[PDB]
Structures are given as structure tokens and as C-alpha cells.
Amino acid sequence: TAFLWAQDRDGLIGKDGHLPWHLPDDLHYFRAQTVGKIMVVGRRTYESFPKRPLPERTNVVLTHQEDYQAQGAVVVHDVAAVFAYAKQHPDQELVIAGGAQIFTAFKDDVDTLLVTRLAGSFEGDTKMIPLNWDDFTKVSSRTVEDTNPALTHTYEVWQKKA
Numbered sequence: 027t028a029f030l031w032a033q034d035r036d037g038l039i040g041k042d043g044h045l046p047w048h049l050p051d052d053l054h055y056f057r058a059q060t061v062g063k064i065m066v067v068g069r070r071t072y073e074s075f076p077k078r079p080l081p082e083r084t085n086v087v088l089t090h091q092e093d094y095q096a097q098g099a100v101v102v103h104d105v106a107a108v109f110a111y112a113k114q115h116p117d118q119e120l121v122i123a124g125g126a127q128i129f130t131a132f133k134d135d136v137d138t139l140l141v142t143r144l145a146g147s148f149e150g151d152t153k154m155i156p157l158n159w160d161d162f163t164k165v166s167s168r169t170v171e172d173t174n175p176a177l178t179h180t181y182e183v184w185q186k187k188a
């Protein structure tokens with residue numbers, strides 16, 4: 027199980043229910059780091075995607091609303107249902123794409139971090155949950171420079187030590 031995110035230099039991930047930046051490169055790598063997988067997102071991050079569902083991947087939406095409707099998405103109500111779905115699934119990798127409340131609900135079962143680090147600093151109200159960095163190794167790092175230098179970003183892959 028991977029966590030799929032993008033943060034500024036201080037850890038910020040969101041502002042007013044939406045992204046605090048607009049960084050097309052990093053949403054091209056959202057679509058294909060989850061083309062094909064089981065993608066888990068919290069109800070509010072699902073409602074803030076422009077197309078609902080975004081296509082070619084299993085969108086699982088985590089909501090406490092018993093009645094919620096999301097045509098074409100897998101609507102569950104606790105973490106045990108996520109993993110009961112993933113157990114049925116097998117051959118699809120599970121990627122937790124946010125936001126903060128859902129990262130906290132899977133904080134013990136993530137093995138890989140897929141983090142995009144912005145060089146700048148943005149204003150908002152939601153930060154990435156604290157994690158033990160010391161328990162992971164950075165395996166891969168690729169940097170992309172943008173003409174807004176706040177937007178220059180690094181894609182890191184981190185994997186959990188034995």
C-alpha cells in the first residue's frame with residue numbers, strides 16, 4: 027500500500043477544499059501512478075476532482091454518510107471495507123491518495139511513499155500527517171524545474187526499511 031501525495035516545502039497539501047497550487051505536470055503523474063490501481067480518497071477530496079469519477083482506475087470513496095451516492099465509484103464506510111475490497115482484487119495495487127483524514131486512517135499500513143515536493147511555500151489550511159521518515163529509505167528522486175520557481179518539484183519514492 028502506497029500513499030500518493032504532493033506537498034510544498036513546509037508540508038502543506040490543501041487550501042479551502044482544493045489544491046493550494048496548479049501544477050499540471052504532477053496531475054499527469056496522478057493519472058498514471060494510478061492508471062489501473064485501486065485508488066482511495068476521502069469523500070471531500072473525491073467531490074473536489076473536476077470529473078467524478080476520474081477514469082481507468084477503481085475510485086474507492088471513504089464516507090460516514092450511509093446514503094452517499096457516487097455512480098461508478100466503490101462507496102465504503104470504514105477502513106476494514108477498503109481492505110475487504112483489496113483482498114477481492116488481488117492483482118490491483120492499493121494507492122491512498124488523500125486527503126489528511128484518510129492518510130491518518132491508513133497511517134499504519136503504508137509501505138511506500140510517492141511524494142512530490144514543491145520548492146516553494148503556499149498558503150493554505152491542510153498539511154500532510156506526520157510520518158516516521160527515519161523508517162523509510164528514498165529509493166528514487168527525479169527533479170522537474172518550472173518557470174514559476176515555487177513550482178519546481180521533485181518526485182520521490184520512499185520504501186519502508188525491514
Ligand SMILES: COc1cc(Cc2c[nH+]c(N)nc2N)cc(OCCC[C@@H](CCC(=O)[O-])C(=O)[O-])c1Br
Pocket residue numbers: 030031032044045050052053054055056057058071074075076080081123124142
Ligand atoms: C482536487 O484537486 C486535485 C487534486 C489531486 C491530488 C494530487 C495531485 N497531484 C499529486 N501528485 N498528488 C495529489 N495528491 C488530483 C487532481 O486531479 C487529477 C486529474 C488528472 C486526470 C488526468 C489529467 C491530465 O493528465 O492532464 C485523471 O483522470 O487522472 C485534482 Br483536480
